[PDB]
Amino acid sequence: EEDASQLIFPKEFETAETLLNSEVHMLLEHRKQQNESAEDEQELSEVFMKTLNYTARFSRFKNRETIASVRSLLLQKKLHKFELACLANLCPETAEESKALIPSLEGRFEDEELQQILDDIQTKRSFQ
Amino acid sequence: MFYHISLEHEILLHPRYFGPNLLNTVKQKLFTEVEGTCTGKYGFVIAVTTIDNIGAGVIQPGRGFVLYPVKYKAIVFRPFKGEVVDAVVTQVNKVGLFTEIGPMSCFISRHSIPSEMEFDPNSNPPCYKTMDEDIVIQQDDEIRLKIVGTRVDKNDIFAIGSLMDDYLGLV
Amino acid sequence: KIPPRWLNCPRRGQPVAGRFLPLKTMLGPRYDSQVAEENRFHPSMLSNYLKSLKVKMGLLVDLTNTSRFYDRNDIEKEGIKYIKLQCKGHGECPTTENTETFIRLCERFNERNPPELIGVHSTHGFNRTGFLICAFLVEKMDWSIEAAVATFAQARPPGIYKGDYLKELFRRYGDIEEGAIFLEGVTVKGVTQVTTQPKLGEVQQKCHQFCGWEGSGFPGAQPVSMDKQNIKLLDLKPYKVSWKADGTRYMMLIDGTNEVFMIDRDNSVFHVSNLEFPFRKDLRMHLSNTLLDGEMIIDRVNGQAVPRYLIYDIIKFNSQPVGDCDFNVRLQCIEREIISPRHEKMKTGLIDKTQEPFSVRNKPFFDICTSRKLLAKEVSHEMDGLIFQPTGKYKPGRCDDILKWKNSVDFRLKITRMGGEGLLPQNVGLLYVGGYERPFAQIKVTKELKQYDNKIIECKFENNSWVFMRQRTDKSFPNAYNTAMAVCNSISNPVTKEMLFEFIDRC
RNA sequence: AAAACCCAGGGAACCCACU
């Protein structure tokens, strides 16, 4: 019934807000830090550090300022939250790759503008 | 997709654990009882961001505990149908492919794997590779998979991937 | 509880077609106490190795209707889905009732835990565990309709089987037409257990005759542990003591020159070859119809372990009822009729101490209130216990006047986040024992304790709770619930050398 | 065969009492 390839979402996830891998990583690291403090509290769940390591391995933006720059760059274009988050997470390099990975971007933006956005993403990608 | 939503749950407090600080007890209860859980409607409850609202405590008539309706920001993830997601390969099998996405185990069976991407147990790591030995998907690799369907069992969800479509496989 | 042949005994059959486990069932910690170790079969044993043995099946199904075999919660805790079925026992095979629904449910599981396999388990694991496996293999595993019916035998060899099941199986899914250790730690040459019934029963019956014992088993006097009530017995009659050393109770029956036998608490009989017991009058003729009571202890002298047998009482001597006499008279008889002739012939060279299997001696004895000196305690560490003999005549069985004086339980620790309803779920290391799955003790779990999980451990009552005395992993199973009752009295009374020494000292 | 008898598995109609 659901298909995000053409942006079919259930009614429950209409007011939902997406997050980056790096945003989730930094939030989970802060929560782990407060878990280190605030004694008389047991360790968190297996899913907690599982997702923490998963999003730390696939982290692409090492700076919170980089996060803010990416959001202030991407929010003002007419993109859906899912498309924007997927573009900022997968980080494609060619407009054909961006359109193939996200088939809901067909005609939303011009392929030259889409390639310029991808080039901006690659410019602000924190390399390792 | 990794989501930041607000969820409502009711926490139950026995009078034995009222104490001088009551709201911290409720915060610990919420931070324990939903964390690491999985729902068929909202997927994996990854983490609780911020406890937003604590409702009025309705004492259950006749029975002792009090009831707290609680609204809270929570980080969650639920698998979808039809999306390419990065994954870590955990095991390569002649029948399928054991992959991992955070806490979710994903099974990519070989019939849903293209004919060129064949299985070889002769290699020291049992792995998937082609005859040209260009794309070698083995243990602990970073790949992308096409989620076809998800199955929930015993309050957790596992999914099935595929590599039929283009640009699927090793990154 | 568990009936005889509660289980067939082969613990787990190999997986049929490497897919379906042909096993059965119960013997949890509650039934560990009433079962032999090879027979012993915990979910842990099929599982603690299973996690890395590649035997880690993810589905468990209990076919037998009765739930008395074991608790199903542990299987879920193991992560194996606990499922139960109502296949009737008593020789009832199913016909797609509670079977077809299970087969579709089993098919549903096939992927519910896929790297994992299935666990199907009837009363004995052959009475329809295979019939259900055979039924399903025909349904989905495409096993041959006749062959699948015979497939269960290939992985689970039937041994005792049920023909009624085979006929329904054949018809529905095809065509119906188709131990005794003498001294632990040191091996003694010449001591040989006797398994020949004609001599074993004769020795047992003659010991019973010499003791005048009513029931079966060990005829010996069995002393009792003391409480604040047993101390009162000072003012009624005199007593006499020796030191209980860590050893095994053994009665020697002297029936001839080579007729020397050992009888332990388990009534097992061993034969001793080279012991010679001269008669005091004529040193050439050897004692007969003589029964002694004593302990076999390992004693290290000059850095070498020398097995020794201390004789602290005598029951029969040449058919004379010496056991009916006074204990002092019996001790003097022991001395003069046992110890003296042997040393007499040893001095003459006719008996070689080096050639005998072990030393023979008599235990020294003392009394009521006085010789306090060892409680200026110089051997306070070397005292393991003390044995209490009154002045009265010998009496078999349980003796309320004969007292035994002597950290310390193996524990099936389960570290569990006990989840209280409406309460913070609280992690606790539950301590329970065999025969007591209910945790008698629950202990605060340290992370260091959390290093050992599901571990059998010796525990020392450091506080009201018992901190681990030792990791008693060597004991595969936790001790009986009754041992917990026994230590429930043993570590409840502080039982001390200063408490009993005078009491064993004066008269 | 936990033979935890942790102690009924019958209902219907009628009559007779007591308040």
Swiss-Prot record, chain C:
It comes from Homo sapiens (Human). Its EC number is 3.6.1.74, 2.7.7.50. Residues 280-336 are annotated as: Interaction with POLR2A. Isoform 1 and isoform 4 (at a lesser extent) are expressed in cerebrum, cerebellum, thyroid, lung, heart, liver, kidney, spleen, large intestine, testis, skin and muscle. Residues 1-178 are annotated as: TPase. GO terms for biological process: 7-methylguanosine mRNA capping; RNA processing. It is found in: Nucleus. One of its GO terms (cellular component) is nucleus. Isoform 2 to isoform 4 lack mRNA 5'-guanylyltransferase activity due to disruptions of the GTase domain. Residues 21-178 form the Tyrosine-protein phosphatase domain. GO terms for molecular function: ATP binding; GTP binding; inorganic triphosphate phosphatase activity; mRNA 5'-triphosphate monophosphatase activity; mRNA guanylyltransferase activity; phosphoprotein phosphatase activity; polynucleotide 5'-phosphatase activity; RNA guanylyltransferase activity. Its main location: nucleus. InterPro entries: Dual-sp_phosphatase_cat-dom, mRNA_cap_enz_bifunc, mRNA_cap_enzyme_adenylation, mRNA_cap_enzyme_C, mRNA_Capping_Enz/RNA_Phosphat, NA-bd_OB-fold, Prot-tyrosine_phosphatase-like, Tyr_Pase_AS. The keyword Hydrolase applies. Keywords: GTP-binding, Host-virus interaction, Hydrolase, mRNA capping, mRNA processing, Multifunctional enzyme, Nucleotide-binding, Nucleotidyltransferase, Nucleus, Protein phosphatase, Transferase. Changing K475A: Loss of GTase activity. Residues 179-507 are annotated as: GTase. It catalyses: a 5'-end triphospho-ribonucleoside in mRNA + H2O = a 5'-end diphospho-ribonucleoside in mRNA + phosphate + H(+); a 5'-end diphospho-ribonucleoside in mRNA + GTP + H(+) = a 5'-end (5'-triphosphoguanosine)-ribonucleoside in mRNA + diphosphate. In the N-terminal section; belongs to the non-receptor class of the protein-tyrosine phosphatase family. It holds the Pfam family DSPc. This is mRNA-capping enzyme. GTP binds at R249, R265, D293, G294, E295, K404, W405, K406, R470, Q471, R472, T473, D474, K475. Interacts with POLR2A (via C-terminus); this enhances guanylyltransferase activity. Binds (via GTase domain) to the elongating phosphorylated form of RNA polymerase II; can form direct interactions with the phosphorylated POLR2A C-terminal domain and indirect interactions via bound RNA. Interacts with SUPT5H and RNMT. Interacts with HIV-1 Tat. The active site is at S122, K244. The keyword Transit peptide does not apply. Bifunctional mRNA-capping enzyme exhibiting RNA 5'-triphosphate monophosphatase activity in the N-terminal part and mRNA guanylyltransferase activity in the C-terminal part. Catalyzes the first two steps of cap formation: by removing the gamma-phosphate from the 5'-triphosphate end of nascent mRNA to yield a diphosphate end, and by transferring the GMP moiety of GTP to the 5'-diphosphate terminus of RNA via a covalent enzyme-GMP reaction intermediate.
